[PDB]
Amino acid sequence: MEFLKRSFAPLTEKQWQEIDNRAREIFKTQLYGRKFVDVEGPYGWEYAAHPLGEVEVLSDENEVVKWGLRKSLPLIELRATFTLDLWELDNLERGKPNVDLSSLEETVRKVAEFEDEVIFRGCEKSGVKGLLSFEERKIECGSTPKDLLEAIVRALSIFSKDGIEGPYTLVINTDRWINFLGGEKRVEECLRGGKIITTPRIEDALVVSERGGDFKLILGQDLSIGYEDREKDAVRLFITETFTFQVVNPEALILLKF
Amino acid sequence: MEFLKRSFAPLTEKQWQEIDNRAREIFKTQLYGRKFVDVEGPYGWEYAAHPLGEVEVLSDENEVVKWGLRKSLPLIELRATFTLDLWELDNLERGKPNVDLSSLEETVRKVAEFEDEVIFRGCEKSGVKGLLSFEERKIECGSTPKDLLEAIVRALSIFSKDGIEGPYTLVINTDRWINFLGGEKRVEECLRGGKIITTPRIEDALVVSERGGDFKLILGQDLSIGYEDREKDAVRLFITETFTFQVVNPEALILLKF
Amino acid sequence: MEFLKRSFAPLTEKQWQEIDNRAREIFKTQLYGRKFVDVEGPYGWEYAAHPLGEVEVLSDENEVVKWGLRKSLPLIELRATFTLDLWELDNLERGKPNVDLSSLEETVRKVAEFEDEVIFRGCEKSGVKGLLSFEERKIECGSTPKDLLEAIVRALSIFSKDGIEGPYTLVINTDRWINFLGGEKRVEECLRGGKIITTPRIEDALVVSERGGDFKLILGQDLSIGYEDREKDAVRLFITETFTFQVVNPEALILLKF
Numbered sequence: 001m002e003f004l005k006r007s008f009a010p011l012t013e014k015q016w017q018e019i020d021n022r023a024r025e026i027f028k029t030q031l032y033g034r035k036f037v038d039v040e041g042p043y044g045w046e047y048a049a050h051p052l053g054e055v056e057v058l059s060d061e062n063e064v065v066k067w068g069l070r071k072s073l074p075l076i077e078l079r080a081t082f083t084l085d086l087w088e089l090d091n092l093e094r095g096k097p098n099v100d101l102s103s104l105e106e107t108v109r110k111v112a113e114f115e116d117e118v119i120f121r122g123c124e125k126s127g128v129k130g131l132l133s134f135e136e137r138k139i140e141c142g143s144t145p146k147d148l149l150e151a152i153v154r155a156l157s158i159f160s161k162d163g164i165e166g167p168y169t170l171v172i173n174t175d176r177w178i179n180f181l182g183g184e185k186r187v188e189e190c191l192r193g194g195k196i197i198t199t200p201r202i203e204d205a206l207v208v209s210e211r212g213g214d215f216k217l218i219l220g221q222d223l224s225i226g227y228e229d230r231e232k233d234a235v236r237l238f239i240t241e242t243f244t245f246q247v248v249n250p251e252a253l254i255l256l257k258f
Numbered sequence: 259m260e261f262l263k264r265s266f267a268p269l270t271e272k273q274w275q276e277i278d279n280r281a282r283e284i285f286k287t288q289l290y291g292r293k294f295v296d297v298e299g300p301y302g303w304e305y306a307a308h309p310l311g312e313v314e315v316l317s318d319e320n321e322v323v324k325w326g327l328r329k330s331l332p333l334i335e336l337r338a339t340f341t342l343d344l345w346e347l348d349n350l351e352r353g354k355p356n357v358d359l360s361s362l363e364e365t366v367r368k369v370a371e372f373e374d375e376v377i378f379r380g381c382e383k384s385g386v387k388g389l390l391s392f393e394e395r396k397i398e399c400g401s402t403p404k405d406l407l408e409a410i411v412r413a414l415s416i417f418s419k420d421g422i423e424g425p426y427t428l429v430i431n432t433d434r435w436i437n438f439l440g441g442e443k444r445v446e447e448c449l450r451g452g453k454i455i456t457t458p459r460i461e462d463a464l465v466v467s468e469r470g471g472d473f474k475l476i477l478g479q480d481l482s483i484g485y486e487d488r489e490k491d492a493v494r495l496f497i498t499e500t501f502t503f504q505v506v507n508p509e510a511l512i513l514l515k516f
Numbered sequence: 517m518e519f520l521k522r523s524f525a526p527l528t529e530k531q532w533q534e535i536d537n538r539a540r541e542i543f544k545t546q547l548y549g550r551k552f553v554d555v556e557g558p559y560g561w562e563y564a565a566h567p568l569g570e571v572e573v574l575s576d577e578n579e580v581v582k583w584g585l586r587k588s589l590p591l592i593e594l595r596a597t598f599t600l601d602l603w604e605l606d607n608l609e610r611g612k613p614n615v616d617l618s619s620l621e622e623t624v625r626k627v628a629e630f631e632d633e634v635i636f637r638g639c640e641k642s643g644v645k646g647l648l649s650f651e652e653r654k655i656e657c658g659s660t661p662k663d664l665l666e667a668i669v670r671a672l673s674i675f676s677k678d679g680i681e682g683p684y685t686l687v688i689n690t691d692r693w694i695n696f697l698g699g700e701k702r703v704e705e706c707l708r709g710g711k712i713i714t715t716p717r718i719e720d721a722l723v724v725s726e727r728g729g730d731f732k733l734i735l736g737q738d739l740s741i742g743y744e745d746r747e748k749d750a751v752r753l754f755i756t757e758t759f760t761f762q763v764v765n766p767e768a769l770i771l772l773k774f
């Protein structure tokens with residue numbers, strides 16, 4: 001909102017709209033975890049920690065008054081800067097329909113990669129545990145389409161034993177999916193009309209349940225673009241966000257090793 | 259309109275309608291680029307240039323007043339003539355339902371070939387750059403249906419990385435499509451219910467996005483038929499048009515080499 | 517409009533009004549061609565070329581499909597910068613009625629000189645042909661008031677033979693008019709109550725007709741003042757415009773040589 005000093009940048013509304021549209025287009029396809037995790041609505045720019053519902057006891061055994069500290073997850077704030085050229089942006093008012101925005105595109109891709117890295121592999125300094133850390137939810141698979149179908153059937157059996165019943169989704173590496181091409185319809189049938197999501201963020205596959213409420217992404221402020229300063233031929237802008245992540249029910253996740 | 263001297267030709271309304279219907283039928287199937295590019299509506303017979311939104315600076319460094327010229331694309335005007343025989347046309351009033359129009363058909367085919375040549379391979383004297391000139395948007399493919407499916411999957415991955423997400427279309431040579439016959443349904447599935455367009459204008463394939471606004475055909479006057487003169491047994495007519503073409507976003511185009 | 521980043525300059529409305537009024541006052545007296553040419557209303561900041569209504573043919577003689585390019589005049593864009601001092605401008609709010617604006621005045625004079633140079637002597641890189649280039653519309657004159665009156669009578673005879681009949685205007689050099697002082701009323705009578713315009717842009721005289729539609733100045737954006745940047749004690753502003761010029765009917769112009 002107002003903390004993004006957007007009205008102090010030497011840009012018109014058309015130029016701001018151009019920048020926003022390009023960034024939104026790239027984020028929509030490059031944010032992969034949001035395709036299957038839950039998003040807990042924005043809390044605001046002042047939100048700092050998310051409760052864990054637990055107390056850690058710090059007093060001795062014999063004290064009359066006993067006390068401890070409540071536990072929480074601190075939010076992560078990120079900021080990434082880039083520069084844009086003013087003459088090239090001003091050609092848009094002369095009527096050019098294809099203005100150069102390569103710096104914006106590269107920075108957007110790096111920010112998306114950072115967020116997906118946190119979701120899939122966690123952050124030790126922050127206390128986040130990623131999806132690929134739950135090593136006890138792992139089964140072995142072969143390298144043939146028959147093996148993939150058998151693995152999916154076994155995974156559904158394990159879900160049934162645990163009591164998890166919703167739509168099911170397969171998340172798989174692109175290079176591995178290329179070898180399994182030709183069985184897409186059969187894979188969908190064995191998943192009971194579920195989704196397949198190909199991604200370069202992982203090396204193997206995994207199967208998840210999308211009934212709702214098992215993986216949470218907590219947002220304070222969603223991804224935003226703001227203004228820093230101006231340096232003699234160009235404007236410096238930044239992308240900012242604040243978030244954290246947690247896995248509530250590990251039983252809704254199975255790793256495939258192959 | 260009135261600049262086509264149509265009311266001065268010795269023809270009746272029925273004969274004019276016959277000629278127009280035949281030409282329209284042939285154009286509708288032989289104009290291939292219009293099957294997947296955008297058409298920017300007619301501007302009129304007086305339109306001359308299309309702006310590029312850019313200035314070229316022509317003054318020295320030390321001048322107090324600095325100046326340059328705006329840049330634009332000039333439109334191309336084409337005219338092709340043919341002759342028709344008056345007695346054979348007059349049999350239509352006696353009641354003949356199949357009058358000979360072979361000269362009209364041949365001229366229509368040549369005009370369509372000219373326009374498609376400009377769209378696919380450009381015009382150096384005019385400043386148009388064709389689709390097959392963007393050589394950096396190229397990936398390699400094999401000569402088996404499995405290879406075609408793999409190439410299409412990789413192309414969709416590249417589109418996803420660039421942020422381009424719309425319906426996808428495959429444009430392929432007819433002789434090459436004959437070898438890939440038998441996998442049409444599978445190709446459609448890998449394209450996510452996209453279109454296939456076979457054409458003899460290219461030697462390989464290409465994949466495009468049809469979200470809208472990436473390839474523009476600018477028309478001043480659409481294809482029209484008019485009257486020139488009369489020579490002793492026949493009427494001389496002509497086909498005319500004025501147009502230009504530009505590729506706005508090269509990221510919505512991938513060339514397949516095989 | 518908004519492409520002039522005026523709202524980002526550290527100036528108040530009173531200071532902007534002061535600057536605008538001074539510039540307008542100087543332009544109104546120093547733009548000489550606008551005193552007798554027609555002005556074709558503003559088309560906008562995106563206008564790039566003006567049609568000439570002509571085709572240049574570029575194909576061979578034997579081709580079935582023949583083609584060419586439409587012709588036009590590209591517009592000229594000019595920008596000139598100057599600096600103003602912030603403390604001296606801020607005295608205006610303390611109540612000073614005579615603030616120093618000498619840089620603005622000098623830049624305005626140079627811009628007006630540039631535009632008049634284009635109107636009177638053309639621009640070869642742009643394709644503009646100036647008034648003094650039409651050398652076939654020339655008659656000889658002496659250096660006495662009787663000679664001037666005789667020359668004007670002969671010029672009106674030539675206009676009558678060509679069919680041009682409107683109000684007539686004499687455009688003459690100031691130093692030469694000083695020698696012809698004393699016959700102003702007689703010159704007006706021989707012109708039939710026409711105007712006299714003295715100017716330092718030419719060395720001899722010329723006579724024109726002001727019936728309308730013979731000399732055209734095409735404007736995209738009229739003369740405007742905008743903001744560039746700020747450098748530590750001062751603001752950098754600029755004057756910008758985009759225009760072109762053409763002589764439609766050379767028969768409404770006669771050059772006097774003396």
Ligand SMILES: Cc1cc2nc3c(=O)[nH]c(=O)nc-3n(C[C@H](O)[C@H](O)[C@H](O)CO)c2cc1C
Pocket residue numbers: 086087090091313315324325326593594595597744
């Ligand atoms: C004809 C012309 C047009 C220009 N237009 C722009 C413009 O739209 N935006 C811009 O930032 N600079 C523009 N410049 C350059 C601008 O003056 C630049 O910031 C200079 O370095 C300032 O002294 C233009 C320069 C010329 C000669």
Ligand SMILES: Cc1cc2nc3c(=O)[nH]c(=O)nc-3n(C[C@H](O)[C@H](O)[C@H](O)CO)c2cc1C
Pocket residue numbers: 344345348349
């Ligand atoms: C019975 C008959 C019918 C004709 N009908 C036509 C006709 O409908 N249209 C035409 O152009 N010429 C027609 N012609 C030929 C026409 O007279 C031709 O232009 C002659 O060469 C003119 O002297 C016809 C000739 C004959 C004998």
Ligand SMILES: Cc1cc2nc3c(=O)[nH]c(=O)nc-3n(C[C@H](O)[C@H](O)[C@H](O)CO)c2cc1C
Pocket residue numbers: 602603606607
């Ligand atoms: C009494 C006083 C009044 C001033 N007023 C102005 C002013 O109205 N505008 C201005 O630009 N500078 C003004 N200055 C100078 C201003 O502080 C200058 O930019 C300094 O160099 C900033 O450190 C003023 C200085 C003094 C001592």
